[PDB]
């Protein structure tokens, strides 16, 4: 049962895991790089919000290619958890 969206999604994830494979250790209080199942984020300094271009696995990525998804890094040095503790982010720009 081919799922073309899933296959492209697995591709983006594979790509992100590696690219964060090379990047060298952080020199300050950060939020560890990660693939939060949506986008790949680098090591982000505490108390700062990170940005990324909308993921290309999205079917409408040609209409939101110029938009951004955001992910907040707390002063703790910890990424932001949604109510249930899952990976949290602002992908409003990227939505259909």
């Amino acid at each position: 049962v081919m799922d073309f969206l899933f296959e492209k999604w697995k591709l983006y994830g594979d790509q992100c895991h590696h690219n964060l494979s090379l990047l060298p250790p952080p020199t300050e209080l950060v939020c560890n790089r990660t693939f939060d199942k949506y986008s790949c984020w680098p090591d982000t300094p505490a108390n700062t919000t990170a940005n990324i271009s909308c993921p290309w696995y999205l079917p409408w990525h040609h209409k939101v290619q110029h938009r951004f998804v955001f992910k907040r890094c707390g002063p703790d040095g910890q990424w932001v958890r949604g109510p249930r503790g899952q990976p949290w982010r602002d992908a409003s720009q990227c939505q259909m």
Epitope: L5, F6, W9, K37, Y38, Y57, L58, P59, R81, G82, P83, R84, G85, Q86, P87, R89, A91, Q95, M96
Partner: antibody, heavy 128, light 108 residues
């Protein structure tokens, strides 16, 4: 054939620590989030802890934060609960529950469907 | 911390009557609410999930409704085995929070 069984309950004195276990069968253990729920002798239901797969997502009810630890051994489909520095408020029956989640790729949302399957439970009595 | 206010604590009913149990969430939880039945000496057993859905193998007399902040559990005609305790559970945010519970006792 999907079942949950909690064991390890008994009598333990305040200050000392106890470990609970929860065995699962009939379903794929790795694919679900597991909860602990307890109920004091004559009181209602209270949520205590929760792990998922990762286990990067563990949460606890306030009264047990820094006191209880939840963990899981997927090889033998078993959930654990470390109970430390026990006290009166811990006296209760402890259940383990199953919960399914779902990640929507297009949206990026994570959906949770609540606790659908419980175990019979096991009693913990803290007293000297 | 979402408070789950359940009413009433205990109610009065005769078998065949219509029973109504309400659950008010302090914070909006959409349809992430579920209802539970607990018989004395046994572990809880879900009846309603997603607020409005009926668990497989549960009498058609049990029905839940509502969304957001207000929820209701209904038994169109109470049955002799239905006279037991019921709990509502919110799985929207951590921590997971239950209602105080409702004990249904047969009236005489």
């Amino acid at each position: 054939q999907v079942q949950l069984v909690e064991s390890g309950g008994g009598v333990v004195q305040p200050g000392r620590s106890l470990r609970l276990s929860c065995a699962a069968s009939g379903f794929t253990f790795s694919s679900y989030g597991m909860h602990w729920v307890r109920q004091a002798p004559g009181k209602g239901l209270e949520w205590v802890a929760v792990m998922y797969y990762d286990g990067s997502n563990k949460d606890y009810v306030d009264s047990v934060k820094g006191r209880f630890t939840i963990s899981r051994d997927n090889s033998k489909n078993t959930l654990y609960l470390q109970m430390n520095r026990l006290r009166a408020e811990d006296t209760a029956v402890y259940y383990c529950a199953r919960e399914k989640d779902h990640y929507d790729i297009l949206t990026g949302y994570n959906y949770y469907y609540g606790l659908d399957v419980w175990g019979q439970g096991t009693t913990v009595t803290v007293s000297s | 911390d979402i408070q789950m206010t359940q009413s009433p604590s205990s109610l009065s009913a005769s078998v065949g009557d219509r029973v109504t149990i309400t659950c008010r969430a302090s914070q909006g939880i959409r349809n992430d609410l579920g209802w539970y039945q607990q018989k004395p000496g046994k572990a809880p057993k879900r009846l309603i999930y997603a607020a409005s859905s009926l668990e497989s193998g549960v009498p058609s007399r049990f029905s839940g409704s509502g969304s957001g902040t207000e929820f209701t559990l209904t038994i169109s005609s109470v049955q002799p085995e239905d006279f037991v305790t019921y709990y509502c559970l919110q799985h929207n945010s951590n921590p997971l929070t239950f209602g105080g519970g409702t004990k249904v006792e047969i009236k005489r």
